[PDB]
């Protein structure tokens, strides 16, 4: 009856870059409120196949 | 395999996407597949031209 | 805007997903995967 799936999220400062191999550090988080409202429009899935 | 390191400022900025339209340059055209079931690699039987 | 700091938090956030829509969504995905 909760009707809400909740995910636990973290904000990180040191991340792997998507544009190439390497790491980068970003400055620490904003002290006020952060709000994001997004539409999940698709999924990226892979398969686990194999002989067994 | 050594490392190249850049140190620079991190100002915070507002960051939110704007839909971007790609457009053909003069001499070119873009064909669009209008099938609602197009699977990504087959033939498309309903094709329109856009810039 | 109600966070603290931890040391020896601020880096803590959550996301809410409609349960009903998510489960319905998977059921439809599954139907297509089942056909395949």
């Amino acid at each position, epitope marked *: 009856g909760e009707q809400n799936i909740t995910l636990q999220c*973290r*904000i*990180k*400062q*040191i*991340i792997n870059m998507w544009q190439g191999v390497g*790491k980068a*550090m970003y*400055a*620490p988080p904003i002290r006020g409120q952060i709000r994001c409202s997004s539409n999940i429009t698709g999924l990226l899935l892979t398969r686990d196949g194999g002989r067994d | 395999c050594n*490392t190249s*390191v850049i*140190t*620079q*400022a*991190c100002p915070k900025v507002s960051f939110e996407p704007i839909p971007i339209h790609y457009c053909a340059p003069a001499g070119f055209a873009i064909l669009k597949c209008n099938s609602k079931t197009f699977n990504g690699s087959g033939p498309c039987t309903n094709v329109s031209t856009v810039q | 805007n109600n966070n603290t*700091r*931890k*040391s*020896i*938090n601020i*880096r803590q956030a959550h996301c809410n997903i409609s349960k009903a829509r998510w489960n319905e969504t998977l059921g439809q995905i599954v139907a297509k995967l089942e056909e395949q």
Partner: antibody
Amino acid sequence: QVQLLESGAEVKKPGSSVKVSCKASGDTFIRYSFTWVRQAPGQGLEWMGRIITILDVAHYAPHLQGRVTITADKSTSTVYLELRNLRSDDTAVYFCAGVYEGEADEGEYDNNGFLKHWGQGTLVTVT
Amino acid sequence: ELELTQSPATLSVSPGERATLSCRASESVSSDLAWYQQKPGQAPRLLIYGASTRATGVPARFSGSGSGAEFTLTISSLQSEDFAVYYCQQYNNWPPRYTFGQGTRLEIKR
């Protein structure tokens, strides 16, 4: 939660380099950032530089950029300082200091310069 | 690098009195200063984290605040234990080029 243990004292002829080190113990090495301070007699806490242990990078005060290297050995939890082209102006008690970076191992590094953990001081002089 | 100027050293404050210490930056600091206590032969222990947070193990007696380039430190009910030189440090520097001032020593009038 880290204790910093300084190495022994040194006396060097001008033009030589000195290697000074600190052993960090009691917690994960990688979660602490480290700095070096030069307590020259009659002076304040001159900052020499800082090393980041996840991204193995370091930054130095401008007047020492061609003179000081700060490095670390992740397997022995040891912070190292090498200062070259020594002058009598460099007579000082040198030491390590550092801070705890929350879950730095997982990418949550805070990047604090507010030093909490300090060594006892290594005296380096010239002759 | 950014210079930090303090009040004159050797502030004679009798034990039990409230001491006032201060620090002026050549440039603005976004509540990014720190205060440290140095005694001869001792580590320069952190007392205040940022402009106003007490560092671990720091008594209520030792506190302060500030903004911009003007910061103030006070010591309530000054103890014989507090007669040390207090250093001002600035961190709003990237790439790091952190600086310290000279600090002010407290003294007992004789």
